[PDB]
Design a protein around this ligand. Structure first.
Ligand SMILES: Nc1ncnc2c1ncn2[C@@H]1O[C@H](CSCC[C@H](N)C(=O)O)[C@@H](O)[C@H]1O
Ligand code: NA
Lengths: 265, 265
């Protein structure tokens, strides 16, 4: 009669919370989805071994189209868990799944875990200064989307930071790198010419947040565009004007050029 | 000779990640602060029992003025942990402590935990739609903080949601309620008269996120301003323009007036 939405956290099998693990262990059935994001520091086998339960993986279609025929039926006479990378309900369409549970007469509870939305605090950028967030998508065929560029412009214009999620092809296990994102934004800039993203724009790259050894780098596009940030996933951030303390952290912790202490403050 | 910044999560001792617990258990010394937020479902005693270590709690003064004299010295010859509610770097000035660590020749690592910043997902509001955040601070003497009002105005004009962290005076055991925040906002509205926050404004309240049964309520200020939302901590959210599914969730899960199902596109 109960469905538990449990987050797996940021990077590996140990990023689930103690509460999430203990509840998952008591569930009769355990489902998971890795189409919204993958757990790059672990494997399904390692997550299964930790939880001590067979984990049934669900595809995007399984969830978006058939959540009520696959997960909810079991949740009516058993305790069921639905595992997702990061924090539950962060993915845009997941909150609606709780409405489906209610419509099916199934109680649901949420067990939180770390999300990139809060983990970016490790960049030293003040959380309150982040504005609207966006995703950088690959142009395809006759389609060249550029809304994420407008988001950066509107945020920066108001002195706010912009969190940029990079395109991911979950099943194909293909990720957009920070380098690719930068190249794309420069191309968008050439078309928009709004002076929003250029070789002189200061950016911050966060890779493998959650890991004990994440990659945190800050610098100008002209210098970071061809830098190796390691294995994905990569997160790109275009900060707005910096508080001197944010600048100092980026220099001391993220290897940013001392130049930002006067150019971007 | 390492220093770990480990988050304890949203509500109780089980909101710590497995990674954080495993590491905290093996540290020689464990420090913590409980002035940046309130974990309403646990006690120092329960946390110590879980980690199996005696925890020395530090005051804001101990940290802000003496972190390098109290904690850092021990990190030179031992493994030290510094625990905090939620995520250690979110809506705190703790990130700056990593700079102090580096200057003392002490390596530091960050272990994230669920944060109220991403827990907003449980309100059904798309997290990417949140704009600049702010804190409703208690007036002090003749000083009456009001900038948080302008933040709401700025986001609202852009159709973005506004997360409002609420004040806390841990040494006085004072935790601002959503009701108190609403009263203060109405007072600022009377003074500024910008039509930003009135009795007809739609607001969302999230209390004790992390617990299994948090209070999630949505409705007009005129109706919620005197409602009992349970024990602290609370956060207040002023949504911007709503998507159809966001409104549906607020009505179905947060008990909002069915009339908000209607969106003025
Ligand atoms: N479990 C919880 N439920 C509701 N609000 C919470 C909360 N935990 C923190 N807050 C809100 O955030 C304020 C503390 S700000 C510090 C936040 C913390 N680092 C984190 O990562 O969550 C509180 O005064 C309250 O308004
Ligand atoms: Na945000």
């Amino acid at each position: 009669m109960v469905l538990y939405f449990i987050g797996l956290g940021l990077y590996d099998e140990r990023d689930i919370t103690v509460k999430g693990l203990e509840i998952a262990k008591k569930c009769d059935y355990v489902f998971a989805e890795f189409y919204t994001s993958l757990m790059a520091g672990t494997t399904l086998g390692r997550i299964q071994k930790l939880i001590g339960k067979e984990i049934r993986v669900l595809s995007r279609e399984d969830v978006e189209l058939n959540f009520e025929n696959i997960v909810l039926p079991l949740a009516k006479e058993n305790d069921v868990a639905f595992l997702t990378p990061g924090d539950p309900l962060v993915a845009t369409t997941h909150a609606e799944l709780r409405i489906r549970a209610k419509r099916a007469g199934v109680e649901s509870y949420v067990i939180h875990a770390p999300s990139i939305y809060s983990a970016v605090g490790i960049t030293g950028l003040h959380i309150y200064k982040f504005g609207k967030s966006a995703t950088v998508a690959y142009p395809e065929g006759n389609w060249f989307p550029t809304s994420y560029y407008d988001v950066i412009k509107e945020n920066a214009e108001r002195g706010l930071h912009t969190l940029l999620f990079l395109d991911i092809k979950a099943e194909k296990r293909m990720y957009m790198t920070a380098n690719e994102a930068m190249e794309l934004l420069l191309k968008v800039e050439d078309m928009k010419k709004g002076g929003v993203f250029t070789d002189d724009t200061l950016v911050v790259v966060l890779a493998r947040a959650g890991s004990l050894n994440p990659t945190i780098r800050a610098g100008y596009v002209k210098d970071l565009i061809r830098e190796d940030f390691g294995d994905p996933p990569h997160i790109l951030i275009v900060p707005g004007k910096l508080h001197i303390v944010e600048a100092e952290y980026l220099v001391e912790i993220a290897g940013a050029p001392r130049e930002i202490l006067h150019v971007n403050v």
